């Protein structure tokens, strides 16, 4: 609600970034192999920005990726809910 769905998204974005590097390392080609850009990749994902920066190529990386979308889009289908309500009320008064 308040800052609750917020926090859960950040669990997703870290645990996602972490496991993505674990899944993709060992697959000849993956660019998703350092914890920095692994984290930035999980934001593009949760937010559906699809910038085309990075993406997984292993099966298990795609699985991690799906979890981020689901758990991210849900969070972000709620984090923006919070911001929207909060700031429309504040700016309107």
């Amino acid at each position, epitope marked *: 609600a308040a800052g609750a769905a917020t926090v859960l998204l950040v669990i997703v974005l870290l645990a996602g970034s*972490y496991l993505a*590097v*674990l899944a*993709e*390392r*060992g*697959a*000849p*080609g*993956a*660019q998703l*192999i*350092t*914890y*920095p850009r692994a984290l930035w990749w999980s934001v593009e994902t949760a937010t559906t920005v699809g910038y085309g920066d990075l993406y997984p190529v292993t099966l298990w990386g795609r699985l991690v990726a799906v979890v981020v979308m689901v758990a991210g889009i849900t969070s972000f289908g709620l984090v923006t809910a919070a911001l929207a309500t909060w700031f429309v009320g504040r700016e309107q008064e």
Partner: antibody
Framework: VQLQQPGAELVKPGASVKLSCKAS????????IHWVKQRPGHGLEWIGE????????NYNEKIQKKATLTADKSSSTAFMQLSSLTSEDSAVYYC???????????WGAGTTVTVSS | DILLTQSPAILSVSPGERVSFSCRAS??????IHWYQQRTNGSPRLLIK???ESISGIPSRFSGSGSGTDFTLSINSVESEDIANYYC?????????FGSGTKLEIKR
């Protein structure tokens, strides 16, 4: 001395050998340990990486995959097992400390391996 | 497997002068190159990370240049303590790879 590995080894041809790397300093969850091979008069040959905490390892596709990586989580020491060697396999063997960001900040002293009877 | 290609192999130079080892990738890797120095008998030693950023404890002589598939280690001046092999190593795509290496010789 951050990454600390033995001085020299001798292996009968066809025998196996284990290689150590004790790492004082930090011991981060996210640390990776790599192993690079330097044949005499050559360049650096990335062999394989291991993340000690979580436990998975990945080896170099291209080379004859003679080795296998392990670690001891509560001793801060990591291992590489080279199985059944020739004299093509005589070289210096470093371990490196990649933080997870893609470069080998910390290097071991290297272990000289000489495969001979 | 990405191919790093350091030309030239050897690099003659007179002391105090600028010097530049080219490294040329086999496809774009952005800025994910890193440079290493390895003198005679000693282990390698990180010089420049991420193609430009410096390392705390490295002489300011070393200057990281380049991006894409053309990269350049530069030493703004040269002195005798700089003779070594110099290696590059990409982190853009798995596996991490190394270059063939360049040795630096000094005409004196």
């Amino acid at each position: 001395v951050q990454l600390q590995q033995p001085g020299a080894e001798l292996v009968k041809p066809g025998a196996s050998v284990k290689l150590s790397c004790k790492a004082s300093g930090y011991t981060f969850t996210s640390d990776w340990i790599h192993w690079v091979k330097q044949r005499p008069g050559h360049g650096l040959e990335w062999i394989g990486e291991i993340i000690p905490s979580y436990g998975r390892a990945n080896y170099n596709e291209k080379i004859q995959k003679k080795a296998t990586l392990t670690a001891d989580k509560s001793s801060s020491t990591a291992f590489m097992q080279l199985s059944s060697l020739t004299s093509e396999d005589s070289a210096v063997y470093y371990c490196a400390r990649e933080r997870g960001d893609g470069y080998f900040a910390v290097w071991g002293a290297g272990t000289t391996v000489t495969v001979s009877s | 497997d990405i191919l790093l290609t350091q030309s030239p192999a050897i690099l003659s130079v007179s002391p105090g002068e600028r010097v530049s080892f080219s490294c040329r990738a086999s496809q774009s890797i952005g800025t994910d190159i890193h440079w290493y120095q390895q003198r005679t008998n000693g282990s390698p030693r990180l010089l420049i990370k991420y193609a430009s950023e410096s390392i705390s404890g490295i002489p300011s002589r070393f200057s990281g240049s380049g991006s894409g598939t053309d990269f350049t280690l530069s030493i703004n001046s040269v002195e005798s303590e700089d003779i070594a092999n110099y290696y590059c190593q990409q982190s853009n795509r798995w596996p991490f790879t190394f270059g063939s290496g360049t040795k630096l010789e000094i005409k004196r």
